[PDB]
Amino acid sequence: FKQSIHQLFETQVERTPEAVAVLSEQGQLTYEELNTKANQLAHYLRTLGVKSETLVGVCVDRSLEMVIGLLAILKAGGAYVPLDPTYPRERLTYMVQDAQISVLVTQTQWSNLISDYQGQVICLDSQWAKIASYSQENLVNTVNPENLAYVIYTSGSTGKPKGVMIEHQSLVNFTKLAIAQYQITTSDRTLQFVSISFDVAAEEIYVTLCSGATLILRTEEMISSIPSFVQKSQDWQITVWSLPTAYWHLLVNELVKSKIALPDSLRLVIIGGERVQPELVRMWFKNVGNFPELINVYGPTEGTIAVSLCRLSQLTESQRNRTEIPIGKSLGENISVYVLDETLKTVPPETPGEIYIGGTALARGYLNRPELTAQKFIQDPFSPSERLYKTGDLGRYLADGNLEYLGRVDHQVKINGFRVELGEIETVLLQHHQVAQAVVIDRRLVAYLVPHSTEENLTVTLQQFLKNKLPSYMIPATFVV
């Protein structure tokens, strides 16, 4: 039963061609229309040399175009590499060079964003008349399941981000499991929330589109305030929210502080990305109750989005009166979530250890980082045909079988909900001429540094320096000497 993610999508299109697939504040596309437009772009991409294992950069804003673009790259047999337009030129250029990207799917408003680029560029906004001349038919046979679907960059502690290579087979497995876990149906309306620079965007997009639900693309404005976010979700009649945990934390505090009613259409809230606060979980159950359903979802990018989940609304009082809220149990049978000792042996229940992931969830590895790949994706000594991914997350299984997240072994953290290696920022700061040694810590980022010379506006100088290298959320608010 061999299948690619776009094939899963294609099966759905055939089932329900006239359903609305994607909605934005600007327009909408039916399943048929999304499929035919992605086919037209895909056919064009094939004529540009895009084929299986070809990496295609995607530098688009959240729009109907974004979705067409992702699906087209997939259908052409390529793997997309998200290139976040809010990142600085130098970071984007690095990714393009590192990934050897020679096709860039973008829009005219982003065209000056690569330190400039010798490959083929397609601007979806200005060249649609050309693209509309290509075939609307599904392409046949362009990938195997072991072929890449996307390469997504994450923070690197040695000083540069690195790409996590995700094959179709792991993504398809994820998507099918999540669809059944969440009970997504053709009646659902899912809010597309996170940037495609984070793999949770793939959950939101593919779970929705491969089940026949409607994907609703959010605006920048709707998240600036919780009342706006809630009211717009009520206007859209949203049934599924997928929220970074830190944003859900904001939401809960504002719910109680105000008398804001949740949308009446909302049936499920999926959270993840960092440790949920038991107090806010208790505050949620007191003020909201058990509907909408609340699920805590865990996993790293390297395990294809998520590997564990816990239905918080199904926890007993006692399970929620604990000091950690569980991250739960494996998303499915072909995914193993282990707590292991230093020799990779399982431990008795309630014994803490490090979380390692096995089975269908695994990334192929890190793009062009053989040392890091060998370090993190380990051959299973007790099952040599298989690999384990070392998560760097500590945890323990409770007697009831639920996994608890216990923290990190290292200096990876989450800032604004985004994965940050403190070593990335620290490594980058050492490159400045007037920094001698440097250390960056949470908690919020504060930089600890001894300069070569003390200049008295060194805050703004190191800030402006990092501004052009690192995403904003990697820039400390304050510095210390």
Ligand SMILES: Nc1ncnc2c1ncn2[C@@H]1O[C@H](COP(=O)(O)OP(=O)(O)NP(=O)(O)O)[C@@H](O)[C@H]1O
């Ligand atoms: N439900 C959860 N509870 C606690 N921690 C979580 C949960 N979900 C994810 N995490 C943490 O987030 C890590 C995985 O981050 P990941 O999803 O790989 O990065 P990201 O947020 O997409 N940003 P990046 O990968 O740098 O672009 C895990 O290893 C945990 O430390």
Ligand SMILES: NC(=[NH2+])NCCC[C@H](N)C(=O)O
């Ligand atoms: N809504 C979700 N399914 N979120 C997934 C949570 C796990 C994911 N690794 C993260 O860091 O966010």
Ligand SMILES: [Mg+2]
């Ligand atoms: Mg993830």
